[PDB]
Amino acid sequence: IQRRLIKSMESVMVKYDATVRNSINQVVQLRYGEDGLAGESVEFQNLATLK
Amino acid sequence: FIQMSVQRIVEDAPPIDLQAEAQHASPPRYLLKFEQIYLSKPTH
Amino acid sequence: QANQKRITTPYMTKYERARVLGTRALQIAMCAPVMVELEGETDPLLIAMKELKARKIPIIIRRYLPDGSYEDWGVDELIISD
Amino acid sequence: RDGKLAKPRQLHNTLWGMVCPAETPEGHAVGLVKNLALMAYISVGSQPSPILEFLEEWSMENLEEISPAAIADATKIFVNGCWVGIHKDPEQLMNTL
Amino acid sequence: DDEEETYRLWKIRKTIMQLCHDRGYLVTQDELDQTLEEFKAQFGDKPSEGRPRRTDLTVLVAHNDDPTDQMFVFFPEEPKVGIKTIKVYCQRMQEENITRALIVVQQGMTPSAKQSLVDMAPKYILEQFLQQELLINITEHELVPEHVVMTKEEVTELLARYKLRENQLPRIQAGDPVARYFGIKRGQVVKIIRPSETAGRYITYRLVQ
Amino acid sequence: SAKNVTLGVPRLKELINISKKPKTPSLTVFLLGQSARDAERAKDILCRLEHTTLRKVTANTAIYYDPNPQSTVVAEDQEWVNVISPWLLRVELDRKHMTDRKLTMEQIAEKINAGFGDDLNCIFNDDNAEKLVLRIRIMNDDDVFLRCIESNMLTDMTLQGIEQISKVYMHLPQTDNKKKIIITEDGEFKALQEWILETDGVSLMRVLSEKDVDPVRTTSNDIVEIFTVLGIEAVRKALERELYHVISFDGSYVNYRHLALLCDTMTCRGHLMAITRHGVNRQDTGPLMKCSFEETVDVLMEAAAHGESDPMKGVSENIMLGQLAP
Amino acid sequence: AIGQRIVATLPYIKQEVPIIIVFRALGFVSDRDILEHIIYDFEDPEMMEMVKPSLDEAFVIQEQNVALNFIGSRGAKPGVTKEKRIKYAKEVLQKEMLPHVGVSDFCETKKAYFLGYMVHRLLLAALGRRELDDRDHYGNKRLDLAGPLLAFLFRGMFKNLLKEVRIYAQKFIDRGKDFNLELAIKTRIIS
DNA sequence: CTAGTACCTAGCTTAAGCCTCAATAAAGCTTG
RNA sequence: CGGAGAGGGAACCCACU
């Protein structure tokens, strides 16, 4: 399963346009994680104004 | 195995009877049946 | 693209930081002239780190946009992360 | 090996006292390679003919002798998996054997 | 068995009218959200051999910007509609100055009629729908996000902004229910507004192929 | 009662390899109003969904040769008072399933008459006697035809419910997300515990198109069926939900970045691009790239035959040639 | 339709053969005699209700030779004439099917009894009177130790030795001068 | 005559090709 | 004489994490 997942996404990367495109420049996401943000620099937080 | 199964394998094999090429001019055969296996101790 | 039309990030990404440091310390190892006065350190990687911190590396980065265009960002001109 | 059907590999209930439950390789041969219990002994085989002559002389009938009229109430005797005959009294033949 | 069929036809009409409103055709609110009782009193409660029968319960609407392009819908009485039972609709197509219409069939349409609908498509861009398929407005479902059809000028603006060619966008096949619901040819991208659990709202663009 | 939902690695396989036949396709059907509030109307919705053949309701079936329908070889005064073929059919139902699913002899007879036309007449006992009898004749290859039609009618008749959904469960959910959530007049959330019902089959379209069934929240746990019914964007969200369900079932956390990227690259082409050699090699990525995965003979001969050119813009393409991968 | 027919795929037979045809080929012309070998108590109608769907499948074969022809047509080596299929299917029934119950001149009654027992066992599982046998039950397993393994392999090598003693004997008796069994025996093969 | 050595000859799944079945329009009667 | 090191391969089995 891991190898099959990797071989389907191994060329998907964030370009200098800040968008996410595969090897053939087809756009997968306009921003990485639909926010453009790195996954290693985020935290868990609470929305105070909610409920 | 070496006591009885080899004996039964060597004895239940059918005898072979073999003729010539059906004639020579314008054919008898034989049976060659064998039994009673013997086994000896290792030798070198 | 012209200097007016620069849409890429002004932050030097970690990959640019790694590759610029490697390719500049390699030049220092091949006896390229240093851009910063050293205090006796002999390791080209530390020399390249000092040059990067002082913003004196004589290298610019060509960032290829997906459409095919590119931008020339000078190492002195964009923000270093660390 | 390398098969996703874990049913053959599992320790079966009938492994009590004949196959060691603990001992098996941890690799791709779990449950497939199994050792032998201590007092577990493997039968070596013998001719069933003496059992046949012993059986045919108490009160049982071979298949050729009887009709299937009386075969439903009696019990079927198998020797090495071949249906040898029919006996009216299972008890006191089990005890005799 | 007429209450169930009347309710089914009422929901079909409601979904079709909502489809027209979403597609852009002019519909009043009164017909947009009418209860089952208005449908009963206006059509007749007796789909079996009665006055709420098909063919003169059909809807015609017009676009908001100009009342020139008009869109009929048609509910054939035949379960499996055929060429002879759609050539009549095509004759109406021609005798009116209309361009496109819908066909909400009762059972599966015949392949000959499907091939016809393919063949006169450039002259008359008409498409089909199923009786079963139109008992729910799929856009109302929680899984289906907000789909918005882009106009050509803003498609060009999108392409010029992102400096990407037409085929590099994420795409959508014309046969899937949302694209068939709106009614849209190939080479026509759709704004898709969906909520993001990471950062608020996210806009994605799917092109029809 | 229905926790055979096959979570874990098998569900991950069923999602990655988008399979037409999952092991446990199931609905999560919600209810609209007062039926969601009380159990009796929930049961009424339940019986209209659970598929029911006439095997489920009958006790035993028997055929006789009555020379005269007036003769009534079986002593039944109901036929005497009620009253052209001599070979007839007789089936005995049971009160248990009959009153469990709320049918009538009239409904069963009209179902028979609609399915088979006026080729046979059903004579059913009234719902007053302890015994539940309906007799079948054939109006005017003589009795084996009756035998075959008896088998056909027992196998598939759909007295109530819809096809392909065999068993439906009913329970009050405990988890807040599965529970209905509203907003009160003072801006609270007021987790409501209303009746829901889960199935073991999947239709997703004959279900939502039913009275008193909420066509806004009914997920079907079936990616292909969702693709056929709701469309590719709803597929992405449902696939994300089912892919997050298996990961968060363990209590572990995976950042939404990766789930979103996977569900996007699996659905960025408008069709369900299952991650196999049947979905990854079909996209025009490049013969060199796709000759590294479950391939490297058919792909290469196909590329040679069609004169395909590899732009060498991938990663596993520049890796082969000993070049800097982008 | 009718439903629940009983078939018996047979060694050296490409297609499945209905069991009643197998019994008629084995030698039972009648039908009561065949049912006497499967259902042992005729007062059980549940057994009859499931055995008659297989009975009515084969009411076109009534004698032994047509059933032999039917089996021979399905054989891997289909005979060109009727009397060749007859002999081929008779050989298959005599030796290939159920060797352990006996291979002799007349073992048809014993083979029929055992096959009817097999069918009865299948019906008992179909009705639920009994339960399905377990594959992992090591009562159903046998262990091939050094004895049985060496027997299985020595038997094949011994046959190979005989089928080369025969070749040497043929090569000398075609000319017919004489032959020597000492040279004929190839001691290399077994060891 | 024989030997030594040199030359001749367990399950899965999914697409994918292959086998049969029901509308349908041409082809020709058919009587209005 | 030159420092020569490059030292087949296939198959199966066992075992390690």
Side-chain angles (χ1 to χ4, degrees), chain F residues 12 26 29 31 64 85 89 91 100-101 113 143 149 152 155 175 181 198 206 256 259 285 291 296 300:
Chain F
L12 192 59
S26 66
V29 174
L31 280 299
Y64 304 93
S85 174
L89 188 146
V91 298
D100 284 330
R101 291 179 179 87
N113 289 319
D143 57 19
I149 197 67
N152 200 359
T155 43
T175 65
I181 304 294
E198 301 175 353
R206 302 209 43 210
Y256 171 80
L259 305 180
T285 304
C291 72
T296 69
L300 293 171

Side-chain angles (χ1 to χ4, degrees), chain A residues 36-50:
Chain A
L37 269 170
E40 65 183 1
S41 294
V42 289
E43 295 199 11
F44 287 101
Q45 299 176 9
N46 290 318
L47 300 174
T49 183
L50 183 57

Side-chain angles (χ1 to χ4, degrees), chain F residues 53-209:
Chain F
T53 53
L54 187 152
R55 292 183 72 253
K56 299 298 292 294
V57 293
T58 54
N60 56 1
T61 75
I63 67 168
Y64 304 93
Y65 268 20
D66 208 358
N68 189 359
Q70 185 64 77
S71 61
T72 74
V73 57
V74 182
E76 293 297 323
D77 291 331
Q78 56 93 28
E79 211 287 332
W80 286 110
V81 71
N82 193 0
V83 72
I84 300 169
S85 174
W87 60 97
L88 73 165
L89 188 146
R90 187 175 184 270
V91 298
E92 179 58 20
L93 285 78
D94 60 354
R95 311 208 80 104
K96 181 62 182 291
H97 304 111
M98 172 36 48
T99 196
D100 284 330
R101 291 179 179 87
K102 327 302 199 284
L103 277 296
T104 64
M105 321 295 258
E106 290 84 4
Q107 288 171 355
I108 298 171
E110 72 182 2
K111 293 299 288 184
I112 298 293
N113 289 319
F116 311 147
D118 196 74
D119 296 332
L120 81 173
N121 193 1
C122 290
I123 302 91
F124 53 90
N125 191 1
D126 59 13
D127 293 332
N128 293 317
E130 61 181 1
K131 190 181 286 184
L132 266 290
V133 189
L134 69 94
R135 294 188 183 182
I136 287 171
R137 300 279 185 178
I138 170 163
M139 336 306 288
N140 292 317
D141 52 353
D142 60 352
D143 57 19
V144 65
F145 177 74
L146 187 145
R147 183 66 60 84
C148 183
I149 197 67
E150 190 276 332
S151 295
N152 200 359
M153 71 86 58
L154 59 88
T155 43
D156 291 330
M157 261 285 298
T158 73
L159 275 300
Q160 196 176 185
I162 67 173
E163 184 64 25
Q164 189 142 310
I165 297 89
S166 63
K167 179 68 71 177
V168 185
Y169 295 93
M170 181 165 58
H171 65 282
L172 291 172
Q174 299 298 320
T175 65
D176 56 354
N177 57 359
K178 193 177 289 292
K179 289 168 74 173
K180 181 176 173 65
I181 304 294
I182 61 170
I183 293 171
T184 62
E185 69 275 16
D186 48 352
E188 297 294 324
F189 268 98
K190 185 68 176 177
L192 294 178
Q193 188 176 3
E194 66 180 2
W195 288 102
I196 72 164
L197 57 92
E198 301 175 353
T199 68
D200 308 296
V202 54
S203 176
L204 182 44
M205 192 46 208
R206 302 209 43 210
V207 176
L208 278 76
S209 67

Side-chain angles (χ1 to χ4, degrees), chain E residues 11-194:
Chain E
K11 287 197 73 65
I12 287 166
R13 188 181 179 90
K14 188 175 175 66
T15 312
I16 287 297
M17 295 299 291
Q18 288 178 357
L19 186 149
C20 295
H21 194 306
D22 278 337
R23 190 168 291 177
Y25 293 135
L26 196 143
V27 57
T28 184
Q29 188 64 251
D30 291 331
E31 293 179 353
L32 187 60
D33 54 359
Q34 70 177 357
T35 70
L36 192 140
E37 296 298 324
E38 286 90 4
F39 192 107
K40 302 257 277 202
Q42 185 178 1
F43 289 101
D45 194 64
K46 298 301 291 182
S48 297
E49 293 94 10
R51 73 280 191 190
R53 64 176 295 278
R54 318 292 207 274
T55 63
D56 291 328
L57 73 89
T58 66
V59 181
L60 165 65
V61 285
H63 208 276
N64 314 337
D65 49 353
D66 61 312
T68 63
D69 49 353
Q70 298 183 0
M71 181 85 107
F72 283 90
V73 302
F74 297 116
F75 303 167
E77 283 93 0
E78 293 83 3
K80 182 170 182 180
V81 68
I83 292 179
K84 281 88 173 180
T85 59
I86 68 167
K87 292 297 289 182
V88 177
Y89 294 111
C90 185
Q91 288 300 336
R92 184 102 79 81
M93 282 314 317
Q94 283 106 26
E95 66 88 16
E96 295 293 326
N97 49 4
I98 58 176
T99 60
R100 62 203 297 204
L102 269 73
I103 297 89
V104 179
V105 297
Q106 301 294 320
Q107 291 223 30
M109 166 175 321
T110 187
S112 65
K114 296 175 73 67
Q115 295 297 323
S116 68
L117 293 193
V118 174
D119 81 11
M120 73 291 291
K123 186 187 292 295
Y124 284 103
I125 46 175
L126 78 167
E127 76 270 16
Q128 75 156 351
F129 280 102
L130 290 171
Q131 183 180 11
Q132 187 63 254
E133 193 166 324
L134 277 296
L135 286 171
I136 59 169
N137 191 1
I138 65 169
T139 313
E140 299 293 327
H141 202 277
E142 75 178 1
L143 290 175
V144 179
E146 179 69 342
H147 292 80
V148 172
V149 178
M150 310 219 78
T151 63
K152 291 179 287 293
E153 55 272 59
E154 61 187 1
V155 177
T156 58
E157 181 179 359
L158 173 67
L159 299 177
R161 162 65 189 85
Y162 282 98
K163 271 82 73 176
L164 55 88
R165 64 180 66 251
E166 193 186 80
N167 68 74
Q168 292 181 357
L169 289 172
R171 64 183 60 194
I172 177 174
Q173 65 187 5
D176 72 340
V178 176
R180 185 171 53 197
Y181 175 85
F182 284 164
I184 61 171
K185 299 181 290 295
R186 60 178 294 161
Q188 193 176 7
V189 65
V190 172
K191 274 182 70 174
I192 300 184
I193 297 89
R194 65 194 181 189

Side-chain angles (χ1 to χ4, degrees), chain C:
Chain C
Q1 289 178 356
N3 50 1
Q4 181 181 3
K5 296 183 290 294
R6 307 261 285 280
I7 62 170
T8 55
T9 61
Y11 293 97
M12 207 175 88
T13 73
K14 63 171 102 73
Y15 312 103
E16 291 149 322
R17 180 160 55 60
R19 167 166 195 184
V20 165
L21 279 177
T23 197
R24 175 60 184 170
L26 181 62
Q27 292 170 355
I28 307 285
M30 320 195 186
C31 168
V34 297
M35 295 298 102
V36 168
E37 71 295 330
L38 61 83
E39 293 83 3
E41 51 285 359
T42 187
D43 186 74
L45 201 40
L46 321 173
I47 297 169
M49 201 85 68
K50 194 202 210 203
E51 297 192 349
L52 181 63
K53 294 292 211 43
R55 316 169 72 61
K56 301 291 282 187
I57 288 178
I59 299 175
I60 62 170
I61 301 167
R62 181 162 279 164
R63 295 180 171 184
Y64 291 120
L65 274 298
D67 70 33
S69 177
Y70 66 90
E71 293 179 353
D72 280 349
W73 282 84
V75 163
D76 63 358
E77 169 191 342
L78 77 168
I79 320 172
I80 62 170
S81 66
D82 291 333

Side-chain angles (χ1 to χ4, degrees), chain D residues 38-89:
Chain D
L38 282 172
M39 321 195 68
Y41 170 68
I42 305 167
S43 70
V44 75
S46 65
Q47 295 304 111
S49 66
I51 321 179
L52 291 173
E53 291 99 13
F54 176 74
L55 278 173
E56 61 76 30
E57 64 184 2
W58 281 92
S59 61
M60 65 179 288
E61 294 82 3
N62 309 293
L63 273 301
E64 291 82 2
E65 278 86 320
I66 55 170
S67 68
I71 199 165
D73 204 5
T75 51
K76 305 177 280 294
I77 295 90
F78 294 168
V79 175
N80 286 322
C82 70
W83 186 2
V84 173
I86 289 295
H87 198 206
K88 296 291 182 68
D89 200 3

Side-chain angles (χ1 to χ4, degrees), chain G residues 38-55:
Chain G
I38 297 169
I39 297 89
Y40 305 109
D41 199 1
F42 273 19
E43 60 88 21
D44 194 1
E46 196 172 2
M47 272 275 198
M48 311 305 188
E49 299 310 315
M50 185 179 288
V51 76
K52 62 162 63 63
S54 65
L55 277 190

